[PDB]
Amino acid sequence: AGMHVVICPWLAFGHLLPCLDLAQRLASRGHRVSFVSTPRNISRLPPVRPALAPLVAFVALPLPRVEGLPDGAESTNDVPHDRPDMVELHRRAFDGLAAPFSEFLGTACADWVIVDVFHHWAAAAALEHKVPCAMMLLGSAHMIASIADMSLAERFSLTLSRSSLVVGRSCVEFEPETVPLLSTLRGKPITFLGLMPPLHEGRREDGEDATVRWLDAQPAKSVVYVALGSEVPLGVEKVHELALGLELAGTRFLWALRKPTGVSDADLLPAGFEERTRGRGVVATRWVPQMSILAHAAVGAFLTHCGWNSTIEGLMFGHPLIMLPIFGDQGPNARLIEAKNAGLQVARNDGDGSFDREGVAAAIRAVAVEEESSKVFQAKAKKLQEIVADMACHERYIDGFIQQLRSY
Numbered sequence: 001a002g003m004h005v006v007i008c009p010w011l012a013f014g015h016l017l018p019c020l021d022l023a024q025r026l027a028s029r030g031h032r033v034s035f036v037s038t039p040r041n042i043s044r045l046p047p048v049r050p051a052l053a054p055l056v057a058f059v060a061l062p063l064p065r066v067e068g069l070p071d072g073a074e075s076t077n078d079v080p081h082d083r084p085d086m087v088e089l090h091r092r093a094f095d096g097l098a099a100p101f102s103e104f105l106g107t108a109c110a111d112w113v114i115v116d117v118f119h120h121w122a123a124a125a126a127l128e129h130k131v132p133c134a135m136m137l138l139g140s141a142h143m144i145a146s147i148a149d150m151s152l153a154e155r156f157s158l159t160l161s162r163s164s165l166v167v168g169r170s171c172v173e174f175e176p177e178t179v180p181l182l183s184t185l186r187g188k189p190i191t192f193l194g195l196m197p198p199l200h201e202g203r204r205e206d207g208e209d210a211t212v213r214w215l216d217a218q219p220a221k222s223v224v225y226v227a228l229g230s231e232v233p234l235g236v237e238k239v240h241e242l243a244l245g246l247e248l249a250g251t252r253f254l255w256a257l258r259k260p261t262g263v264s265d266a267d268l269l270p271a272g273f274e275e276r277t278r279g280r281g282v283v284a285t286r287w288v289p290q291m292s293i294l295a296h297a298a299v300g301a302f303l304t305h306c307g308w309n310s311t312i313e314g315l316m317f318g319h320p321l322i323m324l325p326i327f328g329d330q331g332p333n334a335r336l337i338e339a340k341n342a343g344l345q346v347a348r349n350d351g352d353g354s355f356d357r358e359g360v361a362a363a364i365r366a367v368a369v370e371e372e373s374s375k376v377f378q379a380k381a382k383k384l385q386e387i388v389a390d391m392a393c394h395e396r397y398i399d400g401f402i403q404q405l406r407s408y
Contacts, residue, residue, distance in 0.1 A: 002029075002030045002031050002032060003031045003032070003111035003112060003402075003405065003406070004031070004032045004033075004034065004108065004109055004110050004111050004112075005023075005026055005031050005032070005033050005034070005110070005111065005112045005114060005405075006033075006034045006036060006105065006108055006110040006112065006113045006114065006131070007019050007022065007023055007033060007034070007035050007036065007114045007115075008036040008037070008101065008113070008114070008115045008116070008119055008122050009037065009115075009116055009136075010116035010117075010118045010119075011037070011038060011041060011074060011075050011076065011090070011094055012075055012076040012077065012231065013041075013044070013075060013077050013229075013230055013231060014229065014231055014307060014309065015116055015136075016037065016041060016045060016075075017045070017046075017309070018138055018169075018196070018309050019035070019114075019136075020035065020045055020046070020048075021196060021198065021199075022114075022193070022196065023035050023048075023052075023056050024048060024049060024052045024056060025196065025395075025398045026398070026402065027048075027052040027055035027056050028051075028052065029398075029399070029402060030055070031055070031402070032055055032057070033055060033056045033057070034057050034059050034104075034108060034110070035056060035057070035058050035059065036059040036061065036101065036104065037058070037059075037060065037061070038060060038061060038062065038063045038074040038097075039060040039062060039074075040072050040074040040075075041074045041075055042058045042060050044075075059104055061097050061100040061101060061104065062100070063093045063094070063096065063097065064093055064096035064097075065093075066089045066090075066092050066093045066096075067089075068085070068086060068089045069086060069089040069090055069092075069093050073086070073090060074093075076090065076231065076233070077230055077231050077261065078090075078261060079261065080260075080261050080262040081232075081233045081234060081235050081260050081261070081262075082235060082262075091118075094118065095121060097121070097122075098121035098122075098124075098125070101121065101122055101125055102121075102124075102125040102128060102129070105125050105126065105129045105131065106129060108129075110126075110129070110131045111131070111132075111405075112131065112132055112133075112134060112405050113125070113126040113131050113132070113133045113134070114133075114134045114136060114167070115133060115134070115135060115136065115159065115163075116135075116136050116159075117135060117136070117137070117152075117155065117156040117159050117160070118152075118155055118159070119159055120150075120155050120158040120159045120162065122159075123135070123158075123159050123161075123162030123163050124162055126162070127162055132164040132165065132408055133162060133163045133164055133165075134163060134164065134165040134166070134167050134191075134405070135159050135160055135163035135165070135166050135167070135188075136167050137166055137167065137168050137169075137185075138167065138168065138169035138193075138196075138308065138309075139168065139169060139170075139308045139330075139332070139333050140168070140169075140170050140174075140175060140178075140308060140332065140333050140336045141168055141170045141174075141175040141178040141179045141182055141192065142175060142178050142332050142333070142335070142336040142339075143168075143308070143332040143333050143336070144166070144168050144182060144185055144190060145178050145181070145182060145332075146331075146332040147185060148182075148185050148186065160185065160186060160188060163188060164188070164189075164408060165188065165189050165191055165404070165405075165408055166185045166188050166189065166190050166191070167191050167192075167193055167401070168190060168191070168192045168193070169192070169193060169194070169195060169196060169308060169312075170192050170194070170195060171192055171194045171195060171387075171393070171394075171397055172192075173387045173390070173393060174195060174384075174387050174388070175336070179192060189408075191400075191401055191404045192397065192401075193397050193398060193400075193401040194393065194394040194395075194396070194397025194398060194400075194401075195312055195387075195388055195394050195397075196312075196394055196397075196398070197312055197313075197316045197388055197389060197391065197394055198291075198312075198313060198316070199391075200291060201289075201290075201291045202289070202291040202292045202295050203289070203292070206289035206291075206292035207292070209288065209289050209292070210284075211254055211282060211284055211288050211289070211293060212289060212292055212293065212296060214254065214282050215254065215293065215296040215298040215299065216296075216298070218252050218298040219298065220297045220298060220300075221297070221298070221299070221300030221378065222251070222252050222298055222300055223251070223252045223253065223254055223296075223298045223299050223300060224246065224251050224252065224253045224254075224300065224301045224302075224303050224322070224364060224368050225253075225254050225256075225293055225294065225299045225301070225302050225303065225319070226242075226246065226253055226254065226255040226256065226257070226303040226304075227255075227256040227290060227302070227303075227304055227310070228242075228257075228258070228304060228305050228324065228326065229258065229304075229305070229307075229310065230258045231258075232258060232259070232260045232326070233260070233326060233327075234260050234326065235260070236260065236263045236267050236268065238354060238355070239257075239260065239263070239268060239269070240269070240270045241355060241356045241357045241360060242324065242355075242357075242360055243269050243270050243273045244270055244273070244357035244360075245346075245355075245356075245357040245358070245359070245360020245361045245363075245364065246277075246281065246303075246360065246364070247270075247273060247276060247277055247281070248357055248360075248361045249360070249361040249364035249365055249368070249369065250280075250369070251280075251364055251368050251369060252280050252281065252298075253277075253280070253281040253282070253303075254281075254282050254284070254288075254293065254299075255281065255282070255283045255284065256284055256288045256290065256293075257283050257284065257285050258285070259285070265285075268285075269283070290313070291317075294313065294314065294316070294317035294319065295317055299317070299319060300319070300320075300368055300374070300378065301319055301320050301321070301322055301364070301367050301368045301374075301377070302314035302317075302319040302320070302321055302322070303321075303322040303324070303364070304321065304322075304323065304324070305323065305324050305326035305327055305330065306323045306324070306325060306326060306327050306330035306331065306333055306334035306345065307326075307327055307330050307333070308330065308333045311323075311333060311334075311337055311343075312388060314343075314381075315342065315381060315384045315385055315388040316385065316388045316389050317385065317389075318378075318381050318382040318384070318385035318389075319381055320342055320343050320344075320367050320374075320377035320378060320380065320381040321334075321337050321342065321343030321344070321367075321381070322343065322344060322346065322360075322363045322364060322367050322368070323337065323338075323343055323344065323345045323346065324346050324355055324360075325345060325346060325347075325348040325353070325354065325355055328353075340380060340384065341376060341377065341380040342377065342380040342381045342384050343367065343377070343381070344363045344366055344367050344377075345363075346359045346360055346362075346363045347359035347362065347363075
């Protein structure tokens with residue numbers, strides 16, 4: 001019997017985009033999915049695959065106006081990094097979705113609600129409407145174990161209290177040391193839905209892209225690919241530390257650079273940085289074919305944030321990770337990849353809790369430059385690729401997850 005699944009992700013593209021993938025994996029089995037978000041966030045998502053058009057419905061709830069929160073500032077991506085006051089206003093707008101969400105669910109005939117840790121009010125609405133609620137923790141088993149071992153912490157606690165089930169993004173193949181030791185998170189059952197590696201997007205025609213024609217000219221495993229994504233909660237000064245770290249370490253690099261919100265193109269990069277790195281380094285601020293780039297023989301390492309989604313994209317192509325300390329909650333996921341010898345976290349300075357050019361260069365030296373250490377990182381990441389890129393294994397975990405939703 002097909003189910004109606006309501007999915008309400010956190011208002012961050014790093015949460016929305018994996019949830020849109022999950023929505024399509026569930027729809028692929030004949031489940032009706034309601035993807036609930038705000039209009040400008042929905043308008044900015046990629047289109048659903050045509051095959052899933054009748055099965056995935058976008059439900060747009062308007063964010064209420066909050067004085068100080070710009071019109072159209074619907075995602076964390078839209079709030080300048082330097083403004084914790086506007087971060088709080090965005091949360092106050094998000095919590096205004098409680099009544100419209102409850103009104104929607106009242107008539108949705110939903111079988112499940114699936115929400116992020118932020119959604120204390122959505123879990124309350126699920127209880128009010130007697131719909132079981134799954135709380136997403138789409139990270140490693142190690143991250144869930146580390147958790148087991150209004151403030152964001154108060155919000156998390158209240159959503160977990162009000163949920164039926166916790167959902168992780170791993171499997172016993174990837175974490176055989178942890179998954180078998182887990183049953184519950186503070187008395188709530190844990191289900192793992194696999195690694196859900198992204199569906200292959202690479203196309204023959206990507207070979208024409210100037211970035212790939214540049215990679216074609218470079219030695220095998222010589223290029224550090226850098227991609228922090230659209231979000232980048234970094235001040236311009238940390239973009240500069242990253243730039244100078246890439247420069248000082250001396251490797252070839254291809255940097256898919258999306259500006260932090262509010263930063264001018266004039267201020268984005270250190271003076272003379274592009275001039276000094278011409279030929280060894282390419283900065284691309286436009287769209288790039290990322291999956292064709294990660295499949296390229298020239299790419300030897302992936303420099304990204306600590307985020308689990310990016311870790312999985314890198315390991316799907318057998319690249320060791322250089323992980324910038326950008327997202328606090330992502331610590332355990334990066335510490336797991338370091339424990340597997342498949343990557344290195346860039347040093348976090350006990351000052352700003354952030355990185356400098358010296359830590360970036362040191363990480364690149366160890367993962368990409370030194371002969372002995374880079375060989376070990378490459379071999380460990382290639383070994384992990386066998387598990388991450390096993391697409392049928394991960395589809396069976398989606399079926400297992402659906403069975404757990406039914407069973408409950």
